[PDB]
Enzyme design. Structure first.
Site, short mmCIF file in Angstrom:
data_model
loop_
_atom_site.label_atom_id
_atom_site.label_comp_id
_atom_site.label_asym_id
_atom_site.label_seq_id
_atom_site.Cartn_x
_atom_site.Cartn_y
_atom_site.Cartn_z
N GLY B 67 -47.23 8.16 31.41
CA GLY B 67 -46.70 8.05 30.07
C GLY B 67 -45.24 8.45 29.95
O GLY B 67 -44.41 8.10 30.79
N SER B 96 -47.19 7.50 38.17
CA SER B 96 -45.89 8.12 38.41
C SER B 96 -45.80 9.56 37.91
O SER B 96 -45.52 10.48 38.69
CB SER B 96 -44.79 7.28 37.75
OG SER B 96 -45.19 6.85 36.46
N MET B 97 -46.06 9.77 36.62
CA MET B 97 -45.98 11.13 36.09
C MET B 97 -47.22 11.93 36.43
O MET B 97 -47.13 13.15 36.64
CB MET B 97 -45.78 11.09 34.58
CG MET B 97 -45.76 12.46 33.90
SD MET B 97 -44.72 13.69 34.71
CE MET B 97 -43.15 12.83 34.74
N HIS B 121 -43.72 4.99 41.19
CA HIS B 121 -42.66 4.01 41.00
C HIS B 121 -41.48 4.73 40.36
O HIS B 121 -41.49 5.95 40.21
CB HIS B 121 -43.17 2.81 40.18
CG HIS B 121 -43.62 3.16 38.79
ND1 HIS B 121 -44.83 3.76 38.53
CD2 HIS B 121 -43.03 2.97 37.59
CE1 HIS B 121 -44.96 3.93 37.23
NE2 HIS B 121 -43.88 3.47 36.64
N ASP B 170 -43.45 -0.29 43.10
CA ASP B 170 -44.77 0.32 43.04
C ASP B 170 -45.34 0.48 44.44
O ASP B 170 -45.28 -0.45 45.26
CB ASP B 170 -45.70 -0.52 42.17
CG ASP B 170 -45.14 -0.79 40.79
OD1 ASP B 170 -44.23 -0.06 40.36
OD2 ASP B 170 -45.62 -1.74 40.13
#
Ligand SMILES: Nc1ncnc2c1ncn2[C@@H]1O[C@H](COP(=O)(O)OP(=O)(O)OP(O)(O)=S)[C@@H](O)[C@H]1O
Lengths: 182, 192
Positions: B67, B96-97, B121, B170
């Site tokens: 997010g 990612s996060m 990514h 990615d």
């Protein structure tokens, strides 16, 4: 010649109806009480134990009736106290010594005769704990802990004839190992 | 709907929600997208556990598609600030996060499930306006990309050059590859 369980049962039939199992318990228990008294650990049987009674039934069935009618043909001293008027030691309500005191009123202050008597208690469920511990209960569980030593047997202190006033500062020691509780 | 449970204690019986019961045992759930509201809620949970006990390990289960970046960095700094070791576990997916908070856990207390999946990514963004403003937002997101790679290398142990090449597009990493990559320490296959 002492009465038999059949003789005492017929005596109770004239005052109770529809109770067969309960009559057998009091008849056998009271009968054994006289034998335990007749042999105060003097015969070959040493250290004669004790067996109290726990009556359970709905209200208005004759539990209070059995305690009163039984005293008529027994002829030993009998009393009747209320469990509701009790609390833990240190509170005004607590009068645990009064139960023994009452017994002497019926026996005319005869310690040798009061130990051979019978006692009855009513409304015992009133002190059942509610499992609520984070607090101290003056009434309830607390009360039961005090009765433990009294049933088993000990020597409670009784103010003579309920106590005249503080100046006397004397008490009466009365064994309770032989006293029965119902 | 949330099921209610009963925690038998000496004082008495108490009714708790399933999420609140686990919070008592130093367990926090990170579910769904990372936003300002969900992120600010987890921070209060960590602080509450710090005061109750600063020497007991905290467990953080992560199942999220990622997010907002700013919402996630507040959690990372909190985990490093407090003394207790924040154990991280990956359930289902870690974007990612979600992957950055996963690897940011305490060294030696990071795990990944046998069938979990991690994806990494580069930061995403965009802007519409004058050319002068686009240059500003471009320099800012570039700093974040550089900053996010520096911290990733610190916990994963890899070099900054390797993270730059692997995060250009990615990249999915299975559970075994994550151990070899330094992202996690082991796999909790069975209970021994
Ligand atoms: N088994 C019984 N047979 C005949 N009459 C009974 C019987 N039990 C109760 N009764 C009648 O019910 C009346 C009251 O009975 P109680 O002895 O007061 O019962 P109880 O359970 O002792 O009530 P409490 O003391 O308030 S709990 C008696 O006087 C009888 O008339």
């Amino acid at each position: 010649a002492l009465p038999t369980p059949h003789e005492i049962r017929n005596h109770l039939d004239d005052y109770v109806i529809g109770q067969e199992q309960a009559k057998k318990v009091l008849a056998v228990a009271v009968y054994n009480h006289y034998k335990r008294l007749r042999n105060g650990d003097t015969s070959n049987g040493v250290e004669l134990g004790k067996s109290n009674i726990l009556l359970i039934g709905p209200t208005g069935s004759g539990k209070t009736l059995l305690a009163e009618t039984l005293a008529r043909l027994l002829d030993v001293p009998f009393t009747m106290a209320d469990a509701t008027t009790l609390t833990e030691a240190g509170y005004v309500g607590e009068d645990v010594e009064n139960i023994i005191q009452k017994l002497l009123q019926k026996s005319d202050y005869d310690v040798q005769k009061a130990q051979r008597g019978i006692v009855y208690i009513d409304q015992i469920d009133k002190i059942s704990r509610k499992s609520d511990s984070i607090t101290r209960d003056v009434s309830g569980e607390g009360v039961q802990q005090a009765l433990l030593k009294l049933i088993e047997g000990t020597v409670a202190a009784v103010p003579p004839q309920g106590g005249r006033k503080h100046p006397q500062q004397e008490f009466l020691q009365v064994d309770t190992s032989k006293i029965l509780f119902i | 709907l949330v099921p209610m449970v009963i925690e038998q204690t000496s004082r008495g019986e108490r009714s708790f929600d399933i999420y609140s019961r686990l919070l008592k045992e130093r367990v926090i759930f990170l579910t769904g997208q990372v936003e300002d509201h969900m992120a600010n809620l987890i921070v209060a949970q960590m602080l509450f556990l710090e005061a109750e006990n600063p020497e007991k390990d905290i467990y953080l289960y992560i199942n999220s598609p990622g997010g907002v970046i700013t919402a996630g960095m507040s959690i990372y700094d909190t985990m490093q600030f407090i003394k207790p070791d924040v154990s991280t576990i990956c359930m289902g997916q870690a974007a990612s996060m979600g992957a950055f908070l996963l690897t940011a856990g305490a060294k030696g207390k990071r795990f990944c499930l046998p069938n979990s999946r991690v994806m990494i990514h580069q930061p995403l963004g965009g802007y519409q306006g004058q050319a002068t403003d686009i240059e500003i937002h471009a320099r800012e997101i570039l700093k974040v990309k550089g900053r996010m790679n520096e911290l990733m290398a610190l916990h994963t142990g890899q070099s900054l050059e390797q993270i730059e090449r692997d995060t250009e597009r990615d990249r999915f990493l299975s559970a075994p590859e994550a151990v070899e990559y330094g992202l996690v320490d082991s796999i909790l296959t069975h209970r021994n």
